[PDB]
Amino acid sequence: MDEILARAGIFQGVEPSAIAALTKQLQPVDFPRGHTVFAEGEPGDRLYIIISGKVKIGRRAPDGRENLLTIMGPSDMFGELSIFDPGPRTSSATTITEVRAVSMDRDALRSWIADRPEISEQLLRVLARRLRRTNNNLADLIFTDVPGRVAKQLLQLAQRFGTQEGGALRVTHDLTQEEIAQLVGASRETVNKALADFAHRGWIRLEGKSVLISDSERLARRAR
């Protein structure tokens, strides 16, 4: 599991042999599927790295309507925004499978950067990347229509969690039909038809909390 940790935004760029010498006394946590690790708006000082399982990053309207910002998995950090720009959690963080993680608090995190200055530019790198992704997600809402947007999401899910079957990519995305619409940021029926059409043409084939992508090249053409 040290192997999964070493793939972090933090542990990337700290001498790999020395990554052993530091991974010791962190608090390692467990969560059942469905656990609110923390809620949007509340204070918090902990940052987590996912050892195993997937966490969904949610945003909730006063109205009661839900929205998913991104899905995190093995090796992804979450809960760092309220640390770096001190303030409240910018969103809810909810487990999607059972989840093994490892957390560290604000001060523990201070030791780390002081002793291993390299971390900061990787941390900078993660937020910058996330900015880029979010910038895109945002423009997609102003500009891209639903099936176009579903295409992007499956594709993004696939670069992040996809495995190979041969020519085709497996995407065990551990999601419900409503969470997928929630990532896409549009109606549930509408996301399902967009998905049905793509299945129709054997571009994708749906199976449980999972999708198999046959024809990524056309898929990527519905994106745009």
**Residues found near ligand CMP in the complex (CB under 6 A):** 44, 57, 69-70, 78-82, 89-91, 93, 130-131, 134-135
Residue 128: both structure tokens together: 């910058």
Comparing CB distances to its own copies, the nearer of 135 and 176 is 135
Does 24 participate in binding its own copies (rule CB under 8 A)?
Answer: no
58 vs 72: CA distance, rounded Å: 11
In this chain, which residue has its C-beta nearest to ligand CMP? Answer: 81
The distance of Cα 149 from the centroid of its chain, to the nearest Å, equals 17
**Residues ≥6 apart with Cβ < 8 Å to 14:** 22, 116, 118, 119
Over the range 144-153, which residues count as b (16 or more CB within 10 Å of their CB) and which as e? bebbbbbbbb
Smallest distance from ligand CMP to CB 26, Å: 17
Q: Report the C-alpha gap between 92 and 79 in whole angstroms.
A: 9
Buried b / exposed e over 48-72, threshold 16 CB at 10 Å, is bbbbebbbbbbeeeeeeebbbbbbb
Name which of its own copies, ligand CMP, none residue 160 binds, using a CB cut-off of 5 to 8 Å depending on partner kind. none
Closest to ligand CMP by CB, 57 or 204 = 57
Residue 177: its H or E element: helix 177-184
- Distance (Å, whole) CA 152 – CA 59: 20
Residue 220: which of ligand CMP, its own copies, none does it interact with, CB under 5 to 8 A by kind? none
Rule CB under 8 A: say whether 41 interacts with its own copies: no
Interaction between residue 62 and its own copies (CB under 8 A): yes
Binding of residue 134 to its own copies (CB under 8 A): yes
Q: Is 183 annotated as a binding residue?
A: yes
| Among ligand CMP, its own copies, none, residue 114 binds (CB under 5-8 Å by kind) | its own copies
- The annotated binding site for 3',5'-cyclic AMP is made up of 64-70, 79-82, 89-90, 134-135, 142-143, 178-188
- The annotated binding site is made up of 64-70, 79-82, 89-90, 134-135, 142-143, 178-188
